[PDB]
């Protein structure tokens, strides 16, 4: 049971963490009142976001791929399929809106705290999430991603099988929906607020120089890691249903699995602030 | 002439040194070994007051242990109701940057003074209104207490201390003789005699009636920021701005203990005797609030939790809780 | 001028001057005894009733 | 009865948490410096308490003047720590009649600790009159040596003769060099020459105010 004895401490390692680096940032933004802002909102949905994908979804998956054999019924399945997209889908939208305040804070600061109240963040919250459960519950509870040749027909019959079949126009609408459209705007952010940093360095440096690592570093660690997690997924999912017999299933799922440890690094990158740490020593 | 003044000002001031140092009969430290100690006192808040735009400045308790005055940064005084959490008024000010506050024996009315030489005085029973303005201090106000329903005494930055009265709305007796700004006062509970502690590292005692200076003291080594009154009526305990608090003694004339700890090198902003004259409750930078003991000079209790610096506190007049005001904009019942 | 504020001061020291002292024990004996003696209706040192805290 | 008498104490509750929620907004809006200086420097002219109020381009100051008097130990400065930024008037006029002393108080101001965050701007006032001393008294007879000094080739000389724009330049960098070291990048020091014939210093002001909450954010955010 050499792969058998592996994968069960690596799938183990990867839940107890994803809960761990959920379960410490709620409870460090719900114990303390100076924590709270406008700003933290949209990290606590995240986080709890990532709370329930990891609770939901990581088992489950990891237990389906081990036995090589779906105990529950199909329509189980078809919920654990539904919220394993919803969570997918959910937790880059808020990421969008993250770098979307950012650029406003940064670009507009003179009108950044009339623009933001806390009124508004609960409705972008809402709207945010209504949108990705539009796509994870309507399209799923319904037939209407269901795919058409003999296999898929077979497999949705049996009730031992789970794999993911779907219909060519639902890869390419879900994929624009969830990752395609919220990489633009998050570029276009972060050259903004990178260039306004490039003017203030430029304008401080004639003003007292007789008398930069650190932004490229700050916009690697946020960019690089996001883009090496979720890249690889969206172009194989509509790679692999533009034309048939190119992606093997072995690596499909790898690229699955390798894009859910994304969600356990947001605690180590969006709650490095010392104001963030503080609470984490004294807990 | 000169000269032969300060040789003749070194002769007294000896002659007087020497006469505090013969009555050093024994330290009250010496005396005082064989009470049983208090012991671990922990106390648990029970209410939290929020509503202040900015931070708070200063507090004080009614006189039926049930409403509260405060003054914010942002101008607006809020009375509040520890009983149900819940405010009663909100009084707009002229001015935003106020440092006092005060209440009524009778609860009526209402002062608070700031940067601005003015004081102003409000009345409760009646809309909120400006019933009389005082003026003629050519630096900004301290600390007032009500004396009394018809005069109050307040002390300003002009090292002068003065006795108001409502009725005219001018000066009656005038207290000279500091040199540096005064920073607080306390008044006895018989209304006769009332204290300051200026910013030379000297505290002097008045006479209300009379109008002169009385007594001396120059134990400290930097400048006073609070001062408290001793139940009794016979000992006052001040605060400074190096972490040492010390206890004095009117008929003895000269200090008796001093509290300080060595991991502690921040200042003090408030300090308050309870009922019992056991306890001194006293506020540091430190952003919490300690407890001392005032015959055994052993700490008996920490009390944290603040956000920011602690500058106001206070004690009911029958010794039922304690309040703290601090910067985070927000006041806490302790109990 | 400054010999006026002196001569101000100087009589001021002079009068601060003569007044009485008592011995330092006796104001220690009071001050404990006063202390001791009430002693039994502070609510912060000696924990009241759960029933009888308004703020309970 | 006594559900009657407590229903209007909830009453009144609501009413004023109304007002303070309205209120919350104007008092976040506004924006908040303190003007600075030392006397004979013409802060009054530029301008006990004396709270001016102007808008620019829709954009809220309360400038909330300090008052005049002779304090060497200063007690207030507490009060003033969540002031946007603090404007410094000095006047070179008075180097032969004196700065040293304006030099101290900056000195003394930038060290304090309960202003490490804020920032300083400072303006050089009365630098119209200077022409007329420099040329036809010398700042070279002086301890620190104007003559020795190198006139550095950064600065601008406006529409001209160099030694008024030496003396400029020397004067300018003295009080940044007292600024530069104890700055450690938390709050910085924005020099700037003005005259009352300036007919807009506001503009000046508003891009250094808008510069200095941006540098604000970046750094908050870790990316400066
Ligand atoms: N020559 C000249 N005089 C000026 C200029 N600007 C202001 N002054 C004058 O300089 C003098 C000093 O400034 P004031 O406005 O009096 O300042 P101040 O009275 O010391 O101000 P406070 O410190 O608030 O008391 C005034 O008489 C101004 O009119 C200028 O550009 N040129
Ligand atoms: C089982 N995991 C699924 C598989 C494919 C897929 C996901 C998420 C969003 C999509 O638009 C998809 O097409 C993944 O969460």
Known sequence: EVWVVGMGIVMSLIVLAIVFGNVLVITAIAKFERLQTVTNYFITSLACADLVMGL????????????????????????????????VTASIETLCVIAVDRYFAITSPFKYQSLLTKNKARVIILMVWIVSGLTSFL????????????????????????????????????????????????????????????????????????????????LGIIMGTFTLCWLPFFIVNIVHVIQDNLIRKEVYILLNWIGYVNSGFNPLIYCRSPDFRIAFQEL | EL?????????????????????????????????????????????????????????????????????????????????????????????????????????????????????????????????????????????????????????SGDTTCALWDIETGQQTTTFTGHTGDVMSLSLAPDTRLFVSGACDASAKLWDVREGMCRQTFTGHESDINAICFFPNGNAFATGSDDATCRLFDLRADQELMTYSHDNIICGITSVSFSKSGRLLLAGYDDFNCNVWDALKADRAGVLAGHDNRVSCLGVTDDGMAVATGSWDSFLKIWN | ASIAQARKLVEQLKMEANIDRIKVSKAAADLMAYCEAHAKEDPLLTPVPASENPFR | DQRNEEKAQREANKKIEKQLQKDKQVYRATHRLLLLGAGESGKSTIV??????????????????????????????????????????????????????????????????????????????????????????????????????????????????????????????????????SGDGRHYCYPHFTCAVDTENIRRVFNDCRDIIQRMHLRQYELL
């Not at chain 2, 935003?96 to 409760?124: H, K, Q």
């Not at chain 4, 920032?119 to 001393?133: H, M």
């Not at chain 4, 000094?149 to 940044?176: C, G, M, N, S, W």
């Open chain 1, 139 to 218: 399209p799923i509870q319904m037939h209407w991603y269901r795919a058409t040749h003999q296999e898929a027909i077979n497999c949705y019959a049996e009730e031992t099988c789970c794999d993911f079949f779907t219909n060519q126009a639902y890869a390419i609408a879900s994929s624009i929906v969830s990752f395609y459209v919220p990489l633009v705007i998050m570029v276009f952010v972060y050259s903004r607020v990178f260039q306004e940093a490039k003017r203030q360095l430029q304008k401080i440096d004639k003003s007292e120089g007789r008398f930069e690592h650190k932004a490229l570093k700050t």
């Open chain 2, 3 to 155: 000269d032969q003044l300060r040789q003749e000002a070194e002769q007294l001031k000896n002659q007087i040194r020497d006469a505090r140092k013969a009555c050093a009969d024994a330290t009250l430290s010496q005396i005082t070994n064989n009470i049983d100690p208090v012991g671990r006192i922990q106390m648990r808040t029970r209410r939290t007051l929020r509503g202040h735009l900015a931070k708070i400045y200063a507090m004080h308790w009614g006189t039926d242990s049930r409403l509260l005055v405060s003054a914010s940064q942002d101008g607006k005084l809020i009375i509040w109701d520890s009983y149900t959490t819940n405010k009663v008024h909100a009084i707009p000010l002229r001015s935003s940057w106020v440092m006092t506050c005060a209440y009524a024996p009778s609860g009526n009315y209402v002062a608070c003074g700031g940067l601005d030489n003015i004081c102003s005085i409000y009345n409760l029973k009646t809309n909120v209104r400006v019933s009389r303005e005082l003026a003629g201090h050519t630096g900004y106000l301290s600390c007032c207490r009500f004396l009394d329903d018809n005069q109050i005494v307040t002390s």
């Open chain 1, 56 to 87: 939901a979804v990581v088992p489950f998956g990891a237990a389906h791929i081990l036995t090589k054999t779906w105990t529950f019924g199909n329509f189980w399945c078809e919920f654990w399929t539904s919220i394993d997209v919803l969570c």
């Open chain 4, 48 to 181: 006990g308490i004396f709270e001016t109020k102007f808008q620019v381009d829709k954009v809220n100051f309360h400038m909330f003047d300090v008052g005049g008097q002779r304090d060497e130990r200063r007690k207030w400065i507490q009060c003033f720590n969540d002031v946007t930024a603090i404007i410094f008037v000095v006047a070179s006029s008075s180097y032969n009649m004196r700065l040293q002393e304006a030099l101290n108080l900056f000195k003394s101001i930038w060290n304090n600790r309960w202003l490490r965050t804020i920032s300083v701007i400072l303006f050089l006032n009365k630098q119209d009159l200077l022409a007329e001393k420099v040329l036809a008294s010398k700042i070279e007879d002086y301890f620190p040596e104007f003559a020795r000094y190198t006139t550095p080739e950064d600065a601008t000389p406006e529409p001209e003769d160099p030694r008024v724009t030496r003396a400029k330049y020397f004067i300018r960098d003295e009080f940044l060099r007292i600024s530069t070291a």
